[PDB]
Design a protein around this nucleic acid. Structure first.
Lengths: 124, 262, 180
RNA sequence: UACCUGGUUGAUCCUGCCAGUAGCAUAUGCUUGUCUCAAAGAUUAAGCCAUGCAUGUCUAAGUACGCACGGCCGGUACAGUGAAACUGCGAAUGGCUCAUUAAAUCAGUUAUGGUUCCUUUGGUCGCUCGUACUUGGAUAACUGUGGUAAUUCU
RNA sequence: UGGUGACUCUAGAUAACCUCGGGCCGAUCGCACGCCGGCGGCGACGACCCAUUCGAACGUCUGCCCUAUCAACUUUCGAUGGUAGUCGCCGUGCCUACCAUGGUGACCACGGGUGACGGGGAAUCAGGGUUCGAUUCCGGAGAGGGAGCCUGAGAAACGGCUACCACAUCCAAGGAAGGCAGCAGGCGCGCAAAUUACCCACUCCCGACCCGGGGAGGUAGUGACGAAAAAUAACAAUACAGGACUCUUUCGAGGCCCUGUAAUUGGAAUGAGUCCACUUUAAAUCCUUUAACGAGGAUCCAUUGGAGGGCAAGUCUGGUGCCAGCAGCCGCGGUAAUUCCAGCUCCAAUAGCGUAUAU
RNA sequence: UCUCGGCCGAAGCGUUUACUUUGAAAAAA
């Protein structure tokens, strides 16, 4: 009703098994529409399922009129898992990053550099 | 510096790439290939900046490593592969073909070609030499060696190459009155009929070209690429027919379009 | 090496003589009529007009049928007409030098809000603009120095969310009515 | 915006500089609410450095006999992931700094018909008249014994 | 045979050589499978050799600051040229042997200095010019200072090695290990310059790689270097003077006429701020968006300089009395100081302003 | 143009610089 979606640019993009577009969302008196709501409106609009819809980069114009972002509709969830950035999958819960920081990895690598053979597997 | 350089700063990148400044510090350093660094478009620039089929270099790498791109009929998985003048890009997944032809502004315009024209290209021979038991060899701009060429082919002539077989199917002599296109310098991207060729021994020979509308310009001999015999090109031309429009005419055309705009 | 850009340009010039009565009087008069915050706004508009005049003089030193003169002069004249500073019929490079800082200060959003019956006074106009009560065509404009174009003049409404145009009572009115 | 003003004299007109005046770039003092962009151990010390990180790398396609896991079940040549190590490639790019350096560096110009060139791309690759249904010896990794206070030593 | 403006070019034919330190002519790997022992398709990798790309290295012409209290320089220990060679990737005094005596210079050679890396460029600028350019792009050079090397295609490499010099670290005193002018950070130096943060999501680079790595880079932190926008109030009714088409004797009134100490009276408006939810983005943050609260001394309290002239703005008041001080300059201060110290008032710029220095 | 010249069939330095005008070639920022 009060929130509308219109996809200005649109390409079929058979090379990455997805359709990509720019989303213009009209929310004249509300906060920035959550990504899940935009995803379900897109799924209703393009006769697909919400799990293959990946939206990002939503910037709201000055004054509160409209938000603009980008969206992708993959042909299947397999192609979605195959052609999406890992963080965009992690937003949907389909990916889990490592639980260690860069410092720990670098220090472990430099400690491994000091040992030879299978002992390299026995470092902290 | 020691040895070769592997990076290309974004501002140091060729201007015809139409790269912007704030995206990053680096530009795609084109791979070594059939075309020079400054006269080539990397595959990543064509697949991302021009066709918008990808948003980042990661997606370009995905597209290329799915083996969807064929430059001159062969699959290339190098994102920074230098595709140059007259190269034919084929994407059978989307069923579309492009020919890298210079825009009248000096830039590789996205020029879609029919699948029949996608089967051949035009190559300007750079050198001809007899070698190794008297076999004649011919080297073009695509850096491809062709043995046993026609004896009537000389330097600055342009052969027509069948991309599937790599053999010469026809050729055009560098002669006055043949159509030609400029591949360097100020007149880069312009198309016209050769009028005369002033020769300066020991130096660069200058070729004079006349536009279809009658605008005469000049160029060096190395920057002329014969396109057709007479005034009939052997390839399809971009939306501009090689005619350079003065800024006054560009402004007038844009204003006229805006007058009838929607 | 950084992806950042450093091209930054100062938009004004301070006068050579700091304290001269004539210049001070004229600058304060301009501030008074057009409700500007300080002298730097006058200096900024003067710098804009000075750059325009320098371009006009440069173009005027060329030949009449000069492609650069023709192209650049037509561009400059069209730009000055589009913002309404120049008359639609005064489209020659000589009429550029006859312009004044008044012609540019008249095109601000403050002046246009005050002169379209949207504000009681020009300072009221600035306070309205700075508080997001004014919109142009569709965008809520908030910068009083907005130089409105000629086709943008006819669309200066009173927003669609401001208490004066959008009907939602403001903080003060809501708080006062909620205790009554 | 192609500009000047105060100061030698009892007063004047000059030469003339001092001082003023406006940017700019460093430092510094006082003060500081919002927001966007953004420089930042150059100047003196190319002075000295604790510590941590900054260059690593495997595909279906070089080498798998680490049960480290492990299968469709087995007396199975090698199921498959696969650390380690050998092999290959990169480490000569990047980043920093400006101490050198005065036709030296550098810029435009031209030459290599006076040279080298990993890589990419194309070509050439039975053009040679004289165990092959696949040759040999190791050396890692692995096991096992050690030295040294000490190291990415061996 | 072909080509160049030009070869002692390319190609062809001869007569021979062919370095154990061969110089090529595949003993390599994956996938899918089809015919009568054999035959094969798609690849990956590797290897001469020629082009090509990326270059590198060398030459040509023209062009760099100040100095003559630098006028002669080079020529023993190559200085200019020629011949032969050596070395080199090749041209070459690059280096030798022999020969010639040449070569450069007021058109400034040679020497010295440079708080001199060069350039694209920066500041200023009527027209000319002056000054700057350590600094993110290009080229050069260096890795504490010199020198010599290995590997490789490419290094005279320094997050490679070897040695000496200067520093410096551990030691059981026998030995061993070093190179932040990388990113942070520390000391020191000084007038003078930030976090021992997060991430490879972007830009690209590297690798056997669609998969790994990257203090390169990106993102945040400090940040009044600097630049852009930009709040600190707006409106109305009133006690007041002010003002005007009108008549009036000074009023009336002018409120789509307008000022002010008004710390009067009102309602409106709103963001600074604190908290929400999104949005942003690898996570964050910051903007933006939506809410809730948030202004009357709107205490949610603007400063820095100055008030004799130059140059804007008080010979008002109090104090000091050639003191203390101000003052870029002229000058002020010696008991009515417009100039100092303060109060009030004003005015210049304004979230900025003063000062020192260079230009 | 001079070996005369491809719908009647070509001179475009067959003695030099400066200067002036043109063209080519010349990174991006």
């Amino acid at each position: 009703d009060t929130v509308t979606i219109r996809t200005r640019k649109f390409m079929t993009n058979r090379l990455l098994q997805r359709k990509q577009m720019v989303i213009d969302v009209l929310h004249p008196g509300k906060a920035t529409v959550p990504k899940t709501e935009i995803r379900e409106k897109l799924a209703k609009m393009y006769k697909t399922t919400p799990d293959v819809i990946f939206v990002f980069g939503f910037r709201t114009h000055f004054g509160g009129g409209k938000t603009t972002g980008f969206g992708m509709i993959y042909d299947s969830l397999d192609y979605a898992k195959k052609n999406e950035p890992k963080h965009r999958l992690a937003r949907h819960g389909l990916y889990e990053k490592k639980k260690t920081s860069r410092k720990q990895r670098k220090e472990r690598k430099n400690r491994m550099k000091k040992v030879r053979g299978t002992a390299k597997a026995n470092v902290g | 510096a020691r040895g070769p350089k592997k990076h290309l700063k974004r501002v140091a990148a060729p201007k015809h790439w139409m790269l912007d400044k704030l995206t990053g510090v680096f530009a795609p350093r084109p791979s070594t290939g059939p075309h020079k660094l400054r006269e080539c478009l990397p595959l990543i620039i064509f697949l991302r900046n021009r066709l918008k089929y990808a948003l980042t270099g990661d997606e370009v790498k995905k597209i290329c490593m799915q083996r969807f791109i064929k430059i001159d009929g062969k699959v290339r998985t190098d994102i920074t592969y230098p595709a140059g003048f007259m190269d034919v890009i084929s994407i059978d997944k989307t069923g579309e073909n492009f020919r890298l032809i210079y825009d009248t502004k000096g830039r590789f315009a996205v020029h879609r070609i029919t699948p029949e024209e996608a089967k051949y290209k035009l190559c300007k021979v750079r050198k001809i030499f007899v070698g190794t038991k008297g076999i004649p060899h011919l080297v073009t701009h695509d850096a491809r060696t062709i043995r046993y060429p026609d004896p009537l082919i000389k330097v600055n002539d342009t052969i027509q190459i069948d991309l599937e077989t790599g053999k010469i199917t026809d050729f055009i002599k560098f002669d006055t009155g043949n159509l030609c296109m400029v591949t360097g310098g100020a007149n880069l991207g312009r198309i016209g009929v050769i009028t005369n060729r002033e020769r300066h021994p020991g130096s660069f020979d200058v070729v004079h070209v006349k536009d279809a509308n009658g605008n005469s310009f000049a160029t060096r001999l190395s920057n002329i690429f014969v396109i057709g015999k007479g005034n009939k090109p052997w390839i399809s031309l971009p939306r501009g027919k090689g005619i350079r429009l003065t800024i006054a005419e560009e402004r007038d055309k844009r204003l006229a379009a805006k007058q009838s705009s929607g | 090496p950084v992806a950042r850009s450093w091209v930054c340009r100062k938009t004004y010039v301070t006068p050579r003589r700091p304290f001269e009565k004539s210049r001070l009087d004229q600058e304060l008069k301009l501030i008074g009529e057009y409700g500007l915050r300080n002298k730097r706004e006058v200096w900024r508009v003067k710098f804009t007009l000075a750059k325009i005049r320098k371009a006009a003089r440069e173009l005027l030193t060329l030949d009449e049928k000069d492609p650069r003169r023709l192209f650049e002069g037509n561009a400059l004249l069209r730009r000055l007409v589009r913002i309404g500073v120049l008359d639609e019929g005064k489209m020659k490079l000589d009429y550029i030098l006859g312009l004044k800082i008044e012609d540019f200060l008249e095109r601000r959003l403050q002046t246009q809000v005050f002169k379209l019956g949207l504000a009681k006074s020009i300072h009221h106009a600035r306070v309205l603009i700075r508080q997001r009560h004014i919109r142009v065509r569709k965008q809520v404009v908030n910068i009083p120095s907005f130089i409105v174009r000629l086709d943008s003049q006819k669309h200066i409404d009173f927003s669609l969310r401001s208490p004066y145009g959008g009907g939602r009572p403001g903080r003060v009115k809501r708080k006062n009515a909620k205790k009554g």
